[PDB]
Structure formats: structure tokens, C-alpha cells
Design an enzyme around this catalytic site. Structure first.
Site, short mmCIF file in Angstrom:
data_model
loop_
_atom_site.label_atom_id
_atom_site.label_comp_id
_atom_site.label_asym_id
_atom_site.label_seq_id
_atom_site.Cartn_x
_atom_site.Cartn_y
_atom_site.Cartn_z
N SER A 213 0.75 -1.24 0.00
CA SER A 213 0.00 0.00 0.00
C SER A 213 0.80 1.32 0.00
CB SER A 213 -0.95 -0.04 1.21
OG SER A 213 -1.93 0.99 1.17
N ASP B 278 -9.64 -6.74 -3.31
CA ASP B 278 -9.04 -5.41 -3.27
C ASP B 278 -9.07 -4.73 -4.64
OD1 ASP B 278 -7.49 -3.14 -2.84
OD2 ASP B 278 -5.60 -4.24 -2.64
N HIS C 23 -7.44 -5.68 0.87
CA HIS C 23 -6.25 -4.88 0.65
C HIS C 23 -5.06 -5.37 1.50
CE1 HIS C 23 -4.02 -1.46 -0.78
NE2 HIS C 23 -3.92 -0.91 0.42
#
Length: 208
Positions: free
Chosen positions: A110, A161, A187
Site C-alpha cells: 500500500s 481489493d 487490501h
């Protein structure tokens, strides 16, 4: 086992103190180093509690997880760039130099994409391996730069995700890559399916 872990969580990087957690074989010898970055809602502590640092250490690797500027125990450090843009690729180079890890495998999920991608593409910066987990800013690196990276990559993401598919469209431009889609994961897929994540990770690191 005889895995040694320390959190001297403090190295000076470009004039600021950053916190870090570390786990290594114990004998003091390791095949190579693995640098783990984190998402905005997490930190090095998340990797510790998930068992990743320990797992990697007993497999023969030196595992180092740091807290990025302004997050975790690195709260007082100032970020080199705002969310929305790439950080200097030289930032992680300084990190690697302070800890004397040598060319490391970078695990980047991320938020950390803003730090890892510019580093992956820095001049002369050829890493042993790269493990992106739905990183941000993947569209800020052009095809030409991606195609120039020879480092082996394990593209990991959860099929639940929406950033998984998106970031993959760009990351697939990496010459040498394999994909690890985690079914029924979101995610932070490594948190949803720990065993599958750790197994795929170790299997990957073995082939380097």
C-alpha cells in the site's frame, strides 16, 4: 529455535531518527536481508505480531521492518513528500546504508509504494527481489522505467481489493515477475490469510 530479535529501533536517516524492529538467524549469518515497509494503518509492529519477522529469521534471512516517517514510533520524523507524490528514491538507499543490510528484498504494501517504487527505479539500484502488495503510485512510474528493472518480483494482492487489479496493470510491466493472488482477501491480504502469505513469500525468497 535460536532467532535473535532486536528493536534498537533507531537509526539516523537524512537527519531524522527512524524506528526499526529486526530479527535474524541468531548465529549471526543470513543469506541476505529483507526490508519490510508498511501500510498507513500499520507499522513494523504489525509484521512482528503477524510472525513474519520471526518466520523469515528462522528461514535464514535477516528481517528488518521500519516505521516510515510520521507513523509508528517514527512519529516525530517528517515525511520527505506528501501523500500524492513520490518520495526520493534515495530515502530507502539511506535506510539500507544505515542498517548495512546490503542489496535487500523489499516488501512494499500500500502506502509504502511512494517510497519503494522510486528506490526500485533509482540509478544503479538493482535489488535482489521486490514484493509489492497493492502499492500506491504505481501509475507514476512509466513503462520505460518498469521494463528496465531486472529484479525478480512477486506481485501479491487480494482479489477483493480494487487496488489489486489496478496496480497490477502497471506492475506487470516488470520483466521478471510472478503473481500471487490471494482469494477471499482484501487490501491488507497478508493479514487476512497469514499462512498463504507466509508460504508464498518463503517459496519466493527460496528461488533467489
Amino acid at each position: 529455535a535460536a532467532s535473535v530479535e532486536q528493536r534498537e529501533g533507531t537509526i539516523q536517516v537524512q537527519g531524522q531518527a527512524l524506528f526499526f524492529r529486526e530479527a535474524l538467524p541468531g548465529s549471526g549469518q543470513a543469506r541476505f536481508s529483507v526490508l519490510l515497509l508498511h501500510g498507513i494503518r500499520f507499522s513494523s509492529e504489525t509484521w512482528q505480531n503477524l510472525g513474519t519477522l520471526h518466520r523469515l529469521a528462522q528461514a535464514g534471512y535477516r528481517a528488518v521492518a521500519i516505521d516510515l516517517p510520521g507513523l509508528g514510533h517514527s512519529k516525530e520524523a517528517a515525511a520527505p513528500a506528501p501523500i500524492g507524490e513520490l518520495a526520493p528514491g534515495s530515502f530507502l538507499a539511506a535506510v539500507v546504508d544505515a542498517l548495512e543490510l546490503g542489496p535487500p528484498v523489499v516488501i512494499s504494501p500500500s502506502l509504502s509504494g511512494m517510497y519503494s517504487l522510486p528506490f526500485l527505479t533509482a540509478p544503479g539500484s538493482q535489488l535482489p527481489g521486490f514484493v509489492p502488495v497493492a502499492p500506491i503510485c504505481t501509475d507514476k512510474i512509466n513503462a520505460a522505467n518498469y521494463a528496465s528493472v531486472k529484479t525478480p518480483a512477486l506481485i501479491v494482492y487480494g482479489d477483493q481489493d480494487p487496488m489489486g487489479q489496478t496496480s497490477f496493470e502497471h506492475l506487470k510491466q516488470l520483466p521478471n515477475h510472478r503473481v500471487l493472488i490471494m482469494k477471499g482477501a482484501g487490501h491488507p491480504c497478508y493479514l487476512d490469510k497469514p499462512e498463504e502469505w507466509h508460504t508464498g513469500l518463503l517459496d519466493f525468497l527460496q528461488g533467489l
